[PDB]
User: Fold Ribose/galactose isomerase from Novosphingobium aromaticivorans.
Amino acid sequence: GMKIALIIENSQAAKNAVVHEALTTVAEPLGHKVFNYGMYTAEDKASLTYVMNGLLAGILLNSGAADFVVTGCGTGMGSMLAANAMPGVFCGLVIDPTDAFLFGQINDGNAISMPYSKGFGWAAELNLQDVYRKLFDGERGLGYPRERAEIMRKNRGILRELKDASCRDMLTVLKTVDQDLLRAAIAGEKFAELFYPNCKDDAIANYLRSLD
Amino acid sequence: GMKIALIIENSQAAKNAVVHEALTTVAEPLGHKVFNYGMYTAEDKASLTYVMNGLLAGILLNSGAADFVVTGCGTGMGSMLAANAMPGVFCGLVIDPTDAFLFGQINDGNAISMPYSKGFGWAAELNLQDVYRKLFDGERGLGYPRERAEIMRKNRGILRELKDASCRDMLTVLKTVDQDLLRAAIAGEKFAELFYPNCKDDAIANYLRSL
Amino acid sequence: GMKIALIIENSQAAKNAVVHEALTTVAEPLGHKVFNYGMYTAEDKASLTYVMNGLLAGILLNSGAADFVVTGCGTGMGSMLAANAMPGVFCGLVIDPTDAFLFGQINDGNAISMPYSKGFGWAAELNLQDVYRKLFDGERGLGYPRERAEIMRKNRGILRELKDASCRDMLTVLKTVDQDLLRAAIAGEKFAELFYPNCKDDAIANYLRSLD
Amino acid sequence: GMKIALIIENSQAAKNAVVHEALTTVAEPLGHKVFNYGMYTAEDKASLTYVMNGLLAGILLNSGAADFVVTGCGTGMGSMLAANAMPGVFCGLVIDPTDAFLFGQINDGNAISMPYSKGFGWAAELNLQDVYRKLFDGERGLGYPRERAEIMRKNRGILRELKDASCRDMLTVLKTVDQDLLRAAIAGEKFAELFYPNCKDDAIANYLRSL
Assistant:
């Protein structure tokens, strides 16, 4: 069972319900728990940009409040970039079910960003489900092909070490980032309710509270 | 014009020639210069993994030896992840020409990673040309939809600040990363010839020289 | 130059303006003439279904009133199936520019059907232009892969003979098709204006005229 | 279930085994029967062109020897065009699993043609299965969006009538097509074996034997 967090920015806010619905439909019966961090509607007082999506993703993943993050934007590129700017975050840009499958088996990342405008029309919510089914059902990182799973597992490790060298720890990032950006990123009405009970890292929880 | 660098890892080395040709076919007539960092063939003594492609991309972009990097792997995911792990690197995963277009206009990043196995069959080399045409011709960062242009321009800025806060400077990364991984990343037969005459950061050049 | 006809059915009528603009932007500078047969708006009294799209394509191509037809629907599948049920119509289902390029070089058909809902989001209208550029600029049927160029040229010919064996001439079709379907197909407010002056086949012009 | 026929032309004959495997893997457990009419390899004596794929599809479908036909070519366009030239054949060009789903639900055709070269790279066989699961599991033509359901069902009928008007009966077609084309279409080593015991139209069976 995974704690899966959903984060949606203002350009695509009106699509949050649909996406949340696809996600709960697939992940809940699989024994996971879905947390909708919003935006819930385009009229939310607490508005998010794709940059905040990435920052929030970093908070959730590093704190243990989420095991996996689902996000995106019009094309999904913005949110991908922002998320990958964060320590400990490995965010794929996933389009189809094969992409999802391979992402899960080869890269075994902890976030995905998808397009919710570009290529998103009739039945796009059905592709979302197909993708969720590839990601959240089954063991991840077994590699494809399972034989070649060795080189891949190794490389993933080397990547983590490389990123450990480039990126500062999340707490440091929280202390040094634009503080209005940070406040905005966590300003959602349900944030406190969803986060604090699930946050395993006291220092992060303490810092964020300290903003009050 | 732009200095555009090509970097291919071992799983797709056999495709470096096809990718390079597509790339020079479009970029040269546009007045750009293409630097092929290899791998050139599956048999190259200096082999690259997708992690090294990312590391090498950070060296090239932060030193100024390249203005733009073209990379990838079977899916392009691995190189995307590694590249984006690096300071000052904003690497897109591009599939089709509309992806390319939007990347250029919304994100105005400095690298792209593409799949060279998945989806790669007939006329895939032509799609590559269509994508390069979108990327290397015209003004970037003008935004799409246009009504979202200012917001977008500002957000790119805010994103650069965010990453500046999260990532250490490239020179620091070089001194602190696995040193054998670094040596491997720059081991290419032609690395020196392509790199040093174009590097604008002496501290980086001199450090790599010291290895 | 070519005479290029645009046909849009009811589910996507709202998009006729966008498709029509992508089309003229590319085709006119290339020295082609574009004929918009509607639907122009979702508000048109003369409504078309995808079955009519195919029938009209047949009328236009066999009559010589058009040299190429651009149509579609939600997915483009309906209009494709309807277009291809007609004599002398070879309609491709095209998604991306490589598809378009390959269609022109291998099949050299006289119609295309494209999705106007599935996959149709941001910049979808730019992909349209990209596709048009591959279809309406340069020589057709030169083949890809180039080594199969003759084989491909022969096959197109054999295909034509096959369809000649299966399909009745357009005139016969017109005389035996559901007359209500046919009447609705040509009920468009601009049909006459666009058609008769370009129709090369008097027999077809005659037959339709008599239906008033 | 259904009797599902697989037809592969020469440009992609080397891929027949992989396709047959994706299809059996999915379709059989679902209670269907898969009939592989070849080509089996690039070296079959009896070679198929995309034009024959279409001709053969009409034979199988109209004779009731198959309920559904799976075919294709490099792009799938040729087999699609040829298949659709035939009476009683409604062949979609399917790329992805959503395409497949919508086809089954909106158009409820009896054949599909897919690309076995364009876009067919690494891991392409996984998508094949994804597509087949959409096609061969569940009821068809229930519409999507179901808010256009009845409309959709009405239109398919209208389309079948239109095509009845345009295309000649299959036996008339068999008597009037180039007879060498026809012979080559059914020259496959297992044709008789697969077709005859399943043909529900004696007049077609008789005519083909009359050859």
Q: What stands out?
A: The CA atoms of residues 1 and 211 of chain A lie 31 Å apart. The radius of gyration of chain A is 16 Å. The first strand of chain A starts at residue 3 and ends at 6. Chain A touches chain D through twelve residues (CB under 8 Å).
